[PDB]
Design a protein around this ligand. Sequence first.
Ligand SMILES: CC(=O)SCCNC(=O)CCNC(=O)[C@H](O)C(C)(C)COP(=O)(O)OP(=O)(O)OC[C@H]1O[C@@H](n2cnc3c(N)ncnc32)[C@H](O)[C@@H]1OP(=O)(O)O
Ligand SMILES: Nc1ncnc2c1ncn2[C@@H]1O[C@H](COP(=O)(O)OP(=O)(O)OP(=O)(O)O)[C@@H](O)[C@H]1O
Ligand SMILES: [Mg+2]
Length: 463
Amino acid sequence: SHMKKLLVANRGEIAVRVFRACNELGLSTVAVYAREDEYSVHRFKADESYLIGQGKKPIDAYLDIDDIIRVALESGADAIHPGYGLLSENLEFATKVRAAGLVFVGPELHHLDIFGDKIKAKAAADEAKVPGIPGTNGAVDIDGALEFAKTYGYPVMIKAALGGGGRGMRVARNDAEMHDGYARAKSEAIGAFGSGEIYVEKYIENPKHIEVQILGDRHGNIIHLHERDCSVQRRNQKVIEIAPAVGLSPDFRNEICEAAVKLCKNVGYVNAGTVEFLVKDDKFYFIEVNPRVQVEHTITELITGVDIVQAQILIAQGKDLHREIGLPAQSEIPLLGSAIQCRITTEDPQNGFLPDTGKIDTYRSPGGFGIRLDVGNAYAGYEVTPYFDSLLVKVCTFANEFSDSVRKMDRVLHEFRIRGVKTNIPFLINVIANENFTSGQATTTFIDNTPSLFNFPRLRDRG
Ligand SMILES: CC(=O)SCCNC(=O)CCNC(=O)[C@H](O)C(C)(C)COP(=O)(O)OP(=O)(O)OC[C@H]1O[C@@H](n2cnc3c(N)ncnc32)[C@H](O)[C@@H]1OP(=O)(O)O
Ligand SMILES: Nc1ncnc2c1ncn2[C@@H]1O[C@H](COP(=O)(O)OP(=O)(O)OP(=O)(O)O)[C@@H](O)[C@H]1O
Ligand SMILES: [Mg+2]
């Protein structure tokens, strides 16, 4: 009946977060790890740990559906939480997990099918009366894209359907440049995902990347947990996420959250999900839905007081969202404060943001009032391999006023000490020192149009 053992098909800090949620819910936990991930923190943070993908690349080891399912069945896990990334959105993974009889902690399979493709997601937003970005219908060839550029005009944004995390995504304003962008996007789409579905759309200039956290229930209860602002981006990759969007007016934020709720209610969404929007001068446009727990769910947890991962596990258990989990009504969902998220990573801001590798000789972590710490593998003596993502530790500061949250993030970033590997901490310090970020009016072009952000000061570093 009720699940007792839970397996996490992920690594790093998200595995530890789900382990903490399962321990708080009284569920015994099971970890999986690759051979090159043998010294990861998440392996020893679980009750049972099993090696997966023996004789494979570590990324493919974590991506192996059959080995994870075999480990979950041999260990006796009744549920599989996929975390974020890797196989979190994989339709085949969730289908095979539900075929094996296990519980997949995530949305229903039709939601994964709809929101895996950007054309299908845009169509679903159209049936939900959520206005998307004006673009071409479906995925077109190069000449159909050129025709769209003819009728609607430059700029035109070229995005592959399966392109995620800025892989196949590239801007264009000239006809030759648009050919170059289509060529590169086709190469990236065939190489990474094997399907070259490219749709082109009008390029909004200076938008705000607003995203809304949604919790869905199997009974039909769907609530939002306010919105985050992920506008601070370097080359369309999120750097700093703030919540709520203090720059935006509260009524506008309510309209955006209500539109996300309307879309999720039309699709009948269940479990946790994030609806992403682009905001430009009182107009918001739907761009995608992330049907999983996101990396920056922590700041939503801080400003709403709602444990997102615990709610995910209880929804996968089938609990009622209000009666059994105990979440209040949507009008009673509180906005407790204003939180900032920064992921301290190994990529070198003085060396083109390439992920550095090495050994962590010393590691110092702040604490105190208003600080939340979510650490991956960043302990002293840990060897940072090039195999995995550069994420060392997510850190969040929360305060009633956004200015005090900025002050505490500055204190934390100056307090933080990782030596032996080179971090983006000077970059984060420079970004949060900026007045555009401090006023909350940062856009997605804020980083790329600010060369003063890259003037990292000399540090004495004696020792
Ligand atoms: C902690 C907070 O409230 S927020 C951030 C402010 N931090 C501090 O004031 C702590 C003292 N200052 C420092 O540690 C550093 O000088 C910082 C934070 C200003 C950054 O300077 P850095 O270039 O990175 O290192 P710095 O050359 O100045 O110091 C060398 C070492 O002497 C240590 N040190 C610094 N001040 C003192 C001190 N008063 N007594 C003993 N050791 C000290 C540092 O911890 C550092 O050791 P580390 O390698 O583990 O980091
Ligand atoms: N038509 C567009 N005009 C302007 N900017 C766009 C457009 N489409 C996407 N972007 C940019 O893309 C950024 C984030 O990318 P987006 O949300 O479109 O997908 P992604 O990064 O591929 O996916 P994911 O969030 O799943 O990793 C936005 O903050 C915005 O700056
Ligand atoms: Mg995106």
